[PDB]
Design an enzyme around this catalytic site. Sequence first.
Site, PDB file in Angstrom:
ATOM      1  CE  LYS C 293      -2.557  -2.193   3.656  1.00 24.98           C
ATOM      2  NZ  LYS C 293      -3.502  -1.927   4.776  1.00 24.98           N
ATOM      3  NE  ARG C 367      17.789   3.285   1.718  1.00 21.59           N
ATOM      4  CZ  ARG C 367      17.326   4.492   1.424  1.00 21.59           C
ATOM      5  NH1 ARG C 367      17.161   5.416   2.356  1.00 21.59           N
ATOM      6  NH2 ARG C 367      17.019   4.779   0.161  1.00 21.59           N
TER       7      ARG C 367
END
Lengths: 518, 524, 513, 53
Positions: C293, C367
């Site tokens: 979402k 990351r």
Amino acid sequence: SEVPQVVSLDPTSIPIEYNTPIHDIKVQVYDIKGGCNVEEGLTIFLVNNPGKENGPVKISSKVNDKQVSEFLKDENMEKFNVKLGTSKHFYMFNDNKNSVAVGYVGCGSVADLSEADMKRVVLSLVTMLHDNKLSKLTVVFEINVDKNLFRFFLETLFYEYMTDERFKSTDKNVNMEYIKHLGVYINNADTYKEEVEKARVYYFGTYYASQLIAAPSNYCNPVSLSNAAVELAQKLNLEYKILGVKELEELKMGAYLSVGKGSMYPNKFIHLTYKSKGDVKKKIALVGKGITFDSGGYNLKAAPGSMIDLMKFDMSGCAAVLGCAYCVGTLKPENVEIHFLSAVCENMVSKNSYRPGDIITASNGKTIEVGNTDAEGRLTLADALVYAEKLGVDYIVDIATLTGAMLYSLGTSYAGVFGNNEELINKILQSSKTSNEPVWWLPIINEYRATLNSKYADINQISSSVKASSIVASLFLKEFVQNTAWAHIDIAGVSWNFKARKPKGFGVRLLTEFVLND
Amino acid sequence: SEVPQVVSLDPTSIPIEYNTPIHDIKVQVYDIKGGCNVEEGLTIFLVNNPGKENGPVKISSKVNDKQVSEFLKDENMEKFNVKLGTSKHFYMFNDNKNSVAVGYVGCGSVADLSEADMKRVVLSLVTMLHDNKLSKLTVVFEINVDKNLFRFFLETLFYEYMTDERFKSTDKNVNMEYIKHLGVYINNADTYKEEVEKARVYYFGTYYASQLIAAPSNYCNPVSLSNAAVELAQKLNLEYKILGVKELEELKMGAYLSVGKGSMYPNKFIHLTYKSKGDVKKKIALVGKGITFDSGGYNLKAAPSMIDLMKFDMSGCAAVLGCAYCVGTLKPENVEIHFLSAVCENMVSKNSYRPGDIITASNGKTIEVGNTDAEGRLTLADALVYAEKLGVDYIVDIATLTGAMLYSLGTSYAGVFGNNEELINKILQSSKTSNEPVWWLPIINEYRATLNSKYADINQISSSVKASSIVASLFLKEFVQNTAWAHIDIAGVSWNFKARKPKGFGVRLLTEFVLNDALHHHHH
Amino acid sequence: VPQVLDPTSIPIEYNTPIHDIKVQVYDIKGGCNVEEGLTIFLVNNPGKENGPVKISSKVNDKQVSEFLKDENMEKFNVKLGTSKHFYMFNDNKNSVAVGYVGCGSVADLSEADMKRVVLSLVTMLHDNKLSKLTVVFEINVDKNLFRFFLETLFYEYMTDERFKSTDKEYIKHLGVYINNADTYKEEVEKARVYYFGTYYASQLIAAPSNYCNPVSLSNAAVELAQKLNLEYKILGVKELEELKMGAYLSVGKGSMYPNKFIHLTYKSKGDVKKKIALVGKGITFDSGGYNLKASMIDLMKFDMSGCAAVLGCAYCVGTLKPENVEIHFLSAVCENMVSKNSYRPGDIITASNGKTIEVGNTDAEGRLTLADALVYAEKLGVDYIVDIATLTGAMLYSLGTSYAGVFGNNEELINKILQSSKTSNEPVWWLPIINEYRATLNSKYADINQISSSVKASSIVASLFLKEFVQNTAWAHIDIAGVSWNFKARKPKGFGVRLLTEFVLNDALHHHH
Amino acid sequence: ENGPVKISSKVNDKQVSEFLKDENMEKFNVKLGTSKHFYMFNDNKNSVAVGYV
Ligand SMILES: [Ca+2]
Ligand SMILES: [Ca+2]
Ligand SMILES: [Ca+2]
Ligand SMILES: [Ca+2]
Ligand SMILES: [Ca+2]
Ligand SMILES: [Ca+2]
Ligand SMILES: [Ca+2]
Ligand SMILES: [Ca+2]
Ligand SMILES: [Ca+2]
Ligand SMILES: [Zn+2]
Ligand SMILES: [Zn+2]
Ligand SMILES: [Zn+2]
Ligand SMILES: [Zn+2]
Ligand SMILES: [Zn+2]
Ligand SMILES: [Zn+2]
């Protein structure tokens, strides 16, 4: 030139305040060696403590008041720390049994403060100035600052202190008052006095650009903006010429004229000139993007993934160039000739507007296939660059909020510079250091040039697929400079202060430092 | 008619090149039975090898040169294969001690090449012609093609060879050079000679349409386009009539006029007519969509609705005018042809029409506008009413009407809809002989109820049905009362996206359709 | 390697047809012989743009000389990438092919220009059955660009056919005529090593996701280390838990294949004067996780290109065996999958350096894995840490598809990367770590945010995040998100292999020897 | 609206009482959320901070 109107309540000029309350502040620099006086107003100490993070505050300067010095003793001051941005207020009686207000602003733990840290210190100072009916501010420098950082301090203080109320009618701040005196205590005060009025000039050049950028589109239009530029040139004894549609047609500025075809205000090309009295050793043309309103034009059915334009401050380049014209016309540098240029227009939707798929002929003879009417900046800049090169100058520097992609490359703090000449680029980067307006060098990648190969025209206006829009736009602009050192400053990301909801005036000090130090 | 401008630099006419370098090419067809002479220029053999996929190259033709003859020996050629589109160049000195260039283009392993395959062969041939300063090209047919495919070869060669440089100023190709002679060696060559000049006529009709489609919107407008149509009619001694706004109001063309209300150029209705001298046995009206620029109009707040991404909105008018060139040049017998286009601009201004407007067409039916970007069917509605009032046997319209064609037939086949199977079959036959592919799609009457307006007689668009090509066909059908009518949606096929240029699609298709009585006559 | 007919290993071709090409460099001053195969002249015309072709070299064949006369050659122009080749009989009545490739009107070709020249050569090679190719350099190129020419020729010539069975030739000799040919001979075999390191990375990147997984990829790394006598260690989940690699472990939590940390080491025999850790992003498949979402978009799927470049560099380094260096080749390899066990947005996890991280987007997984890999790298006690990763899609809007971006905390190291970009001819541009944006990563609950909620300069924000996992070591970060994949050719570039290898060789290239 | 600050309460400290005098407090306004606090010594020579919101 008369500004056309639809309704009689349509304004016909841009309100500009030249004499601001900042100009009414009397500034005096005193040597710190002679001790600090207090008496009236607010006295603020700029204190740091290198090494020790959040170390204690210690007032080092001599104060010429026994009662005040007793409050500022180390035993009393050690309860406070020097955390960057922190501030405190003190109330006390001086030697003449009069109440005075004293305080400090924490300057952190770095001995040599950066521009960003100093900026935060100034904002804490301005907070103390607001909501307080002070007649005088005194700032005592108990931190190490050089000549340039002191000037940056004054410029930032002046700019952030000033409030633009030109368009308030019933919501003017009834409690806002400006100090009438600013005292500065610093070591070797004779060496800093020279920076005071230079900071005041740099401040207003930046604030002048801000006033133009913040001017609404129903006040600012190609006619009213060129009128303001003429006013500015007359105030500063600059040569000026405003080119109208008839002359622009003679010069065959087809790209610039096409963008403004659908507007109710005709195109106006601004050309201001500063010329030194003696020998001219340097000729410089400064070009600013000047779209007073960018509707996007006939870009109503863009394919998905097409370039989006969400930055609406489309004459920030023109404003920075005109703000630089203020500084240069005031400071009057030697041995230089500067041309301040802007192809000013509107990008409107009407029955007369230019369309995607139009093929237009620029003033250098190259035909351009229009792919997106919302990529109007590079079209107007193309003809402005041809005009600039025909003046026979040494350097051409344009500045423009050209591509929203800058928000994804350098963000909101650093502008980008592109160019065809390493020596010129290095001069811009050097001016960036001394003006304290950050700029980063970005490449013009020639492998992308092939995406501008039009099937029918000489060149495409836009790339249909390459997303590196800031570089592609630079490649397009490069096609309109034959043989002159040229640099391009994309300020699309840095033009507007989104947190404060006001312009930055970015580029005025950068361009002035470039003109002055050359 | 005077073309209005905003500034002085605004062009007032569409540049059109009539005398192209292709017209200077002298074509000679020789019978392959006598052997091929090699003496100058470039000689290319079209070779295939049936069944054996990527089989070796084997030259079947006799060559009247000893040096060229056994350069082309099997031992030398076996390193090369016949994959469709592959090509090689050979350099040698012939028996007359002159340097000649010889080569081949691979034609694959199926004996009957398709229209798409022949295009690939021609494009490889054109690649050898480009970047080469040749004075003559000779093509040796070692494959089998009928007369229609041979003509298609020449048309496609001519069309792809031609380069449109009308809008280059400082980037004109300096190395461009066109051959002045084209030699063709083919079996039973006498039966193919008549196709040469027919191919040249079909080529320019297609290239003329291409020139109109590629003309930018600041050169091409309703005034300048109708001016070009008048020029074309005068060059070919065609009758012509251009209807202006005042006459269109008298004819009550409310749908067509509404689209052009917000334009800076007034509407112009093009009406060209070719009439044979003898008996007129068939009357035909050809209708082309002619939106010189489609901004979409006041469709600025569309519901999260049909999107229009196809920007070549007068390709139908261009095909009709290109057909007028071919018909006016070839001058067929027993026919009367009307070339029609309701030309206009669909702009955004204070004068433009709006969604929710209810407008009255020239047949009295009121239309509720649901989307100003569905302007094509509105202009076609009044054009079809105009066409039927002419009292013709066939009405055929051609238009880049619905982007949905990209999802049904794609970029290669156009779709044809109609109310008359006999007319549809004639369009399909014309597709076969012109080699412009067309596929028949149905007008599904169950969807007609989606056009039931609550307030007007009919809705312009459906609010929910996604089969827009069929719905648009149902809308157009409401403006043909009692005449055989067909509708060719070319929205998917009009533009060559790989080459970034128009195809001129429809010119040869419609011209073959006009010639469909002569093609099916006892004299043929 | 678990299975859900599921393959269990990555097929790798080590002995390619390129290795069978015999290369000879001859000096152009002695004239060019034409006797067999295809001979191509690389010609330019610094005068007229798209000017005519003029062959300067003498050919020891009268018939080929008559073809190459100025009167005959002006029918062709020198437009960059344009080419023509003709087949003819030479003085010995033998079939030969002669032609040219246009090199434009600029004297100094860029790497992009050389690529266009090479692509024209490869097109003729793929459409001609030849035993020999001869290339005559009538243009000026230095030694590094000449090696780049050979590497690119070899790489683009090679065709990866590992995954066709029903949709399934190469020259054996390559001749080169160039001025000062003796100075270029040493570049031939270096180009062959650089080619395969690049092609090896390409083979890993192009490996499908049902072949490439953390187990099969670490297995391939072990094979490579064994072939080249490199030290190797593969860390499993239990050891990663002991090292508390909570950020790296979180990304792989929901996968069916467990995390595998690759650690290869090359150590010189003599003195070790420089220690380097090369870190590659290694997400074998990135589903995006629980980002259903969604705002930053992550659309590109070549998420182990950094690991591939690091392993391709390991091939070159292990083959060339440089002196005075110790190199660690590292990659935190994992999958980012959707399951009931996957990590979630709003998770707060503890990295191996103790810093807590608030997860804001499970699709920003690169990351997180790099954070723990950088902590591991610094604990090795090295001089330079260089990571390479397809980290941020924003690179497509800053530098595009041709130039990678380098960020770092040390100007000396950054300048060495820029040097390596110049000599490898893999373009890299220096971009700043703007510390004013650091405040956007200030989490309300954790020590630091994984992502910024508003700042669009995503490449800089990601660099600021990575910087929090390098305490006191010179570190550089190469974002290759825009340059990793050749979208026109639909294949990997192998970007970074030659750049990283030149970086390792940066003490040798700046040595007195 | 946004009028000056006027302290109504009596404070049992003479030194602070002088700080809260109308002449000193009128420099500040009562805009919702605005605040100023000052540091000073009270009658017993102890440091106190007083202010307003
Ligand atoms: Ca005033
Ligand atoms: Ca601007
Ligand atoms: Ca045959
Ligand atoms: Ca059409
Ligand atoms: Ca009905
Ligand atoms: Ca019949
Ligand atoms: Ca020989
Ligand atoms: Ca060497
Ligand atoms: Ca990667
Ligand atoms: Zn804008
Ligand atoms: Zn725009
Ligand atoms: Zn359309
Ligand atoms: Zn439309
Ligand atoms: Zn990804
Ligand atoms: Zn991701």
